[PDB]
Amino acid sequence: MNIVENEICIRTLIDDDFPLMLKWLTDERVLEFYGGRDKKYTLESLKKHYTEPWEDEVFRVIIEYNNVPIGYGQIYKMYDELYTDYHYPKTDEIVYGMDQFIGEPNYWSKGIGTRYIKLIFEFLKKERNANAVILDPHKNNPRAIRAYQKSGFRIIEDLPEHELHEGKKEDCYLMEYRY
Protein backbone atom coordinates (compact mmCIF):
# COMPACT_ATOMS: atom_id res chain seq x y z
CA MET A 1 0.00 0.00 0.00
CA ASN A 2 1.16 3.53 -0.75
CA ILE A 3 -1.01 6.64 -0.31
CA VAL A 4 0.23 10.21 -0.60
CA GLU A 5 -1.93 13.23 0.21
CA ASN A 6 0.11 16.43 0.66
CA GLU A 7 1.84 16.22 4.08
CA ILE A 8 0.85 12.60 4.69
CA CYS A 9 2.26 9.40 3.26
CA ILE A 10 0.92 6.00 4.31
CA ARG A 11 3.09 3.11 3.10
CA THR A 12 3.81 -0.55 3.73
CA LEU A 13 5.97 -1.41 6.74
CA ILE A 14 9.40 -2.83 5.86
CA ASP A 15 12.18 -4.27 8.01
CA ASP A 16 14.16 -0.99 7.93
CA ASP A 17 11.34 0.62 9.93
CA PHE A 18 11.83 -1.44 13.06
CA PRO A 19 14.58 0.60 14.80
CA LEU A 20 12.34 3.69 14.76
CA MET A 21 9.37 1.62 15.86
CA LEU A 22 11.45 0.41 18.80
CA LYS A 23 12.02 4.06 19.72
CA TRP A 24 8.27 4.66 19.73
CA LEU A 25 7.42 1.48 21.62
CA THR A 26 10.01 2.04 24.33
CA ASP A 27 8.73 5.62 24.84
CA GLU A 28 6.61 5.73 27.99
CA ARG A 29 4.54 8.61 26.54
CA VAL A 30 3.40 6.40 23.68
CA LEU A 31 3.16 3.16 25.65
CA GLU A 32 0.63 4.70 28.05
CA PHE A 33 -1.94 4.57 25.24
CA TYR A 34 -0.67 1.73 23.02
CA GLY A 35 0.70 -1.57 24.34
CA GLY A 36 1.28 -0.45 27.93
CA ARG A 37 4.24 1.02 29.82
CA ASP A 38 5.09 -2.43 31.20
CA LYS A 39 5.98 -3.78 27.72
CA LYS A 40 9.74 -4.29 27.38
CA TYR A 41 10.66 -4.66 23.71
CA THR A 42 14.06 -5.25 22.18
CA LEU A 43 14.61 -4.82 18.45
CA GLU A 44 14.46 -8.58 17.99
CA SER A 45 11.36 -9.19 20.14
CA LEU A 46 9.56 -6.25 18.53
CA LYS A 47 10.32 -7.58 15.05
CA LYS A 48 9.04 -11.01 16.08
CA HIS A 49 5.80 -9.45 17.33
CA TYR A 50 5.21 -7.29 14.26
CA THR A 51 5.96 -10.12 11.83
CA GLU A 52 3.48 -12.59 13.35
CA PRO A 53 1.21 -13.87 10.54
CA TRP A 54 -2.52 -13.23 10.25
CA GLU A 55 -5.26 -15.70 9.28
CA ASP A 56 -6.77 -13.26 6.79
CA GLU A 57 -5.70 -10.07 5.01
CA VAL A 58 -3.60 -7.49 6.86
CA PHE A 59 -1.87 -4.23 5.91
CA ARG A 60 0.92 -3.07 8.22
CA VAL A 61 1.80 0.56 7.46
CA ILE A 62 4.01 3.45 8.48
CA ILE A 63 2.55 6.96 8.65
CA GLU A 64 4.89 9.74 7.46
CA TYR A 65 4.29 13.45 7.97
CA ASN A 66 6.39 16.01 6.08
CA ASN A 67 8.78 13.22 5.11
CA VAL A 68 9.35 11.98 8.67
CA PRO A 69 7.91 8.66 9.85
CA ILE A 70 5.67 9.43 12.83
CA GLY A 71 3.47 6.38 13.46
CA TYR A 72 2.13 2.94 12.65
CA GLY A 73 -1.12 1.31 11.62
CA GLN A 74 -2.46 -2.15 10.95
CA ILE A 75 -5.63 -2.66 8.94
CA TYR A 76 -7.13 -6.15 8.90
CA LYS A 77 -10.04 -8.05 7.39
CA MET A 78 -12.37 -9.15 10.18
CA TYR A 79 -12.04 -12.76 11.31
CA ASP A 80 -13.96 -15.20 13.51
CA GLU A 81 -11.98 -14.67 16.73
CA LEU A 82 -12.86 -10.98 16.66
CA TYR A 83 -16.44 -11.38 15.45
CA THR A 84 -16.94 -13.54 18.54
CA ASP A 85 -15.12 -11.41 21.14
CA TYR A 86 -16.70 -8.21 19.82
CA HIS A 87 -20.19 -9.72 19.86
CA TYR A 88 -20.24 -8.27 16.34
CA PRO A 89 -22.22 -10.51 13.98
CA LYS A 90 -20.64 -11.86 10.81
CA THR A 91 -22.82 -10.98 7.81
CA ASP A 92 -22.37 -10.57 4.05
CA GLU A 93 -20.83 -7.18 4.72
CA ILE A 94 -17.13 -6.58 4.10
CA VAL A 95 -15.71 -5.44 7.44
CA TYR A 96 -12.21 -4.32 8.46
CA GLY A 97 -10.68 -3.39 11.80
CA MET A 98 -7.81 -1.00 12.39
CA ASP A 99 -5.27 -0.33 15.16
CA GLN A 100 -2.91 2.67 15.08
CA PHE A 101 -0.66 5.03 17.00
CA ILE A 102 1.23 8.23 16.36
CA GLY A 103 4.63 7.67 17.98
CA GLU A 104 5.54 11.37 17.98
CA PRO A 105 3.55 12.99 20.81
CA ASN A 106 4.14 16.47 19.39
CA TYR A 107 1.80 15.39 16.57
CA TRP A 108 -1.14 14.46 18.82
CA SER A 109 -4.39 16.48 18.72
CA LYS A 110 -3.49 18.25 15.47
CA GLY A 111 -6.00 16.36 13.32
CA ILE A 112 -3.45 14.06 11.69
CA GLY A 113 -5.01 10.88 13.09
CA THR A 114 -8.39 11.87 11.68
CA ARG A 115 -6.78 12.58 8.28
CA TYR A 116 -5.12 9.15 8.40
CA ILE A 117 -8.39 7.37 9.23
CA LYS A 118 -10.28 9.03 6.40
CA LEU A 119 -7.54 8.04 3.91
CA ILE A 120 -7.83 4.43 5.05
CA PHE A 121 -11.64 4.61 4.75
CA GLU A 122 -11.30 5.72 1.12
CA PHE A 123 -8.72 3.05 0.34
CA LEU A 124 -10.91 0.28 1.78
CA LYS A 125 -13.99 1.46 -0.12
CA LYS A 126 -12.37 1.67 -3.52
CA GLU A 127 -10.03 -1.34 -3.19
CA ARG A 128 -12.15 -3.73 -1.10
CA ASN A 129 -15.77 -2.48 -1.32
CA ALA A 130 -15.81 -2.23 2.47
CA ASN A 131 -19.20 -1.72 4.18
CA ALA A 132 -18.00 -1.15 7.74
CA VAL A 133 -14.85 -0.47 9.77
CA ILE A 134 -14.60 -1.19 13.48
CA LEU A 135 -12.18 -0.71 16.39
CA ASP A 136 -12.08 -1.17 20.16
CA PRO A 137 -10.50 1.68 22.17
CA HIS A 138 -10.18 1.80 25.95
CA LYS A 139 -13.02 3.72 27.60
CA ASN A 140 -10.37 5.82 29.40
CA ASN A 141 -8.77 6.99 26.13
CA PRO A 142 -11.07 9.93 25.26
CA ARG A 143 -8.58 11.52 22.84
CA ALA A 144 -8.80 8.41 20.65
CA ILE A 145 -12.57 8.10 21.08
CA ARG A 146 -13.14 11.75 20.10
CA ALA A 147 -10.87 11.39 17.04
CA TYR A 148 -12.82 8.32 16.00
CA GLN A 149 -16.15 10.15 16.53
CA LYS A 150 -14.89 13.05 14.35
CA SER A 151 -14.01 10.47 11.71
CA GLY A 152 -17.51 8.95 11.75
CA PHE A 153 -17.20 6.00 14.13
CA ARG A 154 -20.03 5.53 16.67
CA ILE A 155 -20.08 3.57 19.93
CA ILE A 156 -22.19 0.44 19.35
CA GLU A 157 -21.19 -1.94 22.20
CA ASP A 158 -19.61 -1.95 25.64
CA LEU A 159 -16.75 -4.43 26.05
CA PRO A 160 -16.10 -4.91 29.78
CA GLU A 161 -12.62 -6.12 30.83
CA HIS A 162 -11.73 -6.46 27.17
CA GLU A 163 -7.97 -5.87 27.13
CA LEU A 164 -5.12 -6.42 29.60
CA HIS A 165 -3.17 -3.16 29.87
CA GLU A 166 -0.54 -2.49 32.55
CA GLY A 167 -1.80 -5.37 34.67
CA LYS A 168 -5.53 -4.50 34.50
CA LYS A 169 -8.27 -5.67 32.13
CA GLU A 170 -9.54 -2.40 30.69
CA ASP A 171 -13.13 -1.76 29.65
CA CYS A 172 -13.43 -0.80 25.97
CA TYR A 173 -15.98 0.44 23.45
CA LEU A 174 -16.74 -1.23 20.17
CA MET A 175 -17.04 1.58 17.62
CA GLU A 176 -18.29 1.26 14.06
CA TYR A 177 -18.16 3.35 10.87
CA ARG A 178 -20.58 2.51 8.04
CA TYR A 179 -19.73 4.98 5.25
Ligand SMILES: CC(C)(COP(=O)(O)OP(=O)(O)OC[C@H]1O[C@@H](n2cnc3c(N)ncnc32)[C@H](O)[C@@H]1OP(=O)(O)O)[C@@H](O)C(=O)NCCC(=O)NCCS(=O)O
Ligand atom coordinates in the same frame (compact mmCIF):
# COMPACT_ATOMS: atom_id res chain seq x y z
C1 LIG B 1 -5.44 8.17 18.86
C2 LIG B 1 -4.75 9.08 17.85
C3 LIG B 1 -4.35 8.27 16.62
C4 LIG B 1 -5.74 10.18 17.46
O1 LIG B 1 -5.17 11.03 16.46
P1 LIG B 1 -5.05 12.62 16.73
O2 LIG B 1 -4.44 13.21 15.49
O3 LIG B 1 -4.43 12.89 18.06
O4 LIG B 1 -6.61 12.98 16.77
P2 LIG B 1 -7.35 14.35 16.34
O5 LIG B 1 -7.87 14.24 14.93
O6 LIG B 1 -6.48 15.52 16.70
O7 LIG B 1 -8.61 14.27 17.31
C5 LIG B 1 -8.41 14.26 18.72
C6 LIG B 1 -9.47 15.15 19.33
O8 LIG B 1 -9.60 14.88 20.72
C7 LIG B 1 -9.32 16.08 21.45
N1 LIG B 1 -8.72 15.67 22.73
C8 LIG B 1 -7.43 15.60 23.06
N2 LIG B 1 -7.33 15.15 24.33
C9 LIG B 1 -8.59 14.96 24.78
C10 LIG B 1 -9.16 14.50 26.07
N3 LIG B 1 -8.35 14.16 27.10
N4 LIG B 1 -10.50 14.43 26.16
C11 LIG B 1 -11.29 14.77 25.14
N5 LIG B 1 -10.80 15.19 23.96
C12 LIG B 1 -9.46 15.29 23.78
C13 LIG B 1 -8.41 16.88 20.54
O9 LIG B 1 -8.39 18.25 20.91
C14 LIG B 1 -9.08 16.61 19.21
O10 LIG B 1 -10.29 17.34 19.09
P3 LIG B 1 -10.42 18.63 18.15
O11 LIG B 1 -9.47 19.62 18.79
O12 LIG B 1 -9.99 18.21 16.77
O13 LIG B 1 -11.87 19.04 18.25
C15 LIG B 1 -3.52 9.74 18.51
O14 LIG B 1 -3.92 10.68 19.53
C16 LIG B 1 -2.55 8.76 19.11
O15 LIG B 1 -1.84 8.08 18.38
N6 LIG B 1 -2.50 8.66 20.45
C17 LIG B 1 -1.64 7.78 21.24
C18 LIG B 1 -1.84 6.31 20.83
C19 LIG B 1 -3.29 5.89 20.84
O16 LIG B 1 -4.07 6.30 21.70
N7 LIG B 1 -3.67 5.02 19.91
C20 LIG B 1 -5.02 4.49 19.72
C21 LIG B 1 -5.32 3.38 20.72
S1 LIG B 1 -7.03 3.15 20.80
O17 LIG B 1 -7.24 1.84 21.56
O18 LIG B 1 -7.48 2.93 19.35
Ligand SMILES: NC[C@H]1O[C@H](O[C@H]2[C@H](O)[C@@H](O[C@H]3O[C@H](CO)[C@@H](O)[C@H](N)[C@H]3O)[C@H](N)C[C@@H]2N)[C@H](O)[C@@H](O)[C@@H]1O
Ligand atom coordinates in the same frame (compact mmCIF):
# COMPACT_ATOMS: atom_id res chain seq x y z
N1 LIG C 1 -7.51 -0.85 20.67
C1 LIG C 1 -6.33 -1.06 19.85
C2 LIG C 1 -5.25 -1.86 20.60
O1 LIG C 1 -4.26 -2.24 19.65
C3 LIG C 1 -3.18 -3.00 20.18
O2 LIG C 1 -3.63 -4.27 20.67
C4 LIG C 1 -4.13 -5.21 19.70
C5 LIG C 1 -3.00 -6.09 19.15
O3 LIG C 1 -2.12 -5.29 18.36
C6 LIG C 1 -3.51 -7.22 18.26
O4 LIG C 1 -2.40 -8.05 17.90
C7 LIG C 1 -2.23 -8.22 16.49
O5 LIG C 1 -1.10 -7.44 16.09
C8 LIG C 1 0.16 -7.82 16.64
C9 LIG C 1 1.20 -6.86 16.07
O6 LIG C 1 1.21 -6.92 14.64
C10 LIG C 1 0.46 -9.29 16.34
O7 LIG C 1 1.65 -9.70 17.02
C11 LIG C 1 -0.69 -10.15 16.84
N2 LIG C 1 -0.43 -11.55 16.54
C12 LIG C 1 -1.98 -9.68 16.17
O8 LIG C 1 -3.08 -10.46 16.63
C13 LIG C 1 -4.53 -8.06 19.02
N3 LIG C 1 -5.02 -9.12 18.15
C14 LIG C 1 -5.69 -7.20 19.53
C15 LIG C 1 -5.16 -6.08 20.42
N4 LIG C 1 -6.26 -5.26 20.92
C16 LIG C 1 -2.49 -2.23 21.30
O9 LIG C 1 -1.45 -3.03 21.88
C17 LIG C 1 -3.49 -1.85 22.38
O10 LIG C 1 -2.85 -1.04 23.37
C18 LIG C 1 -4.62 -1.07 21.73
O11 LIG C 1 -5.62 -0.77 22.72
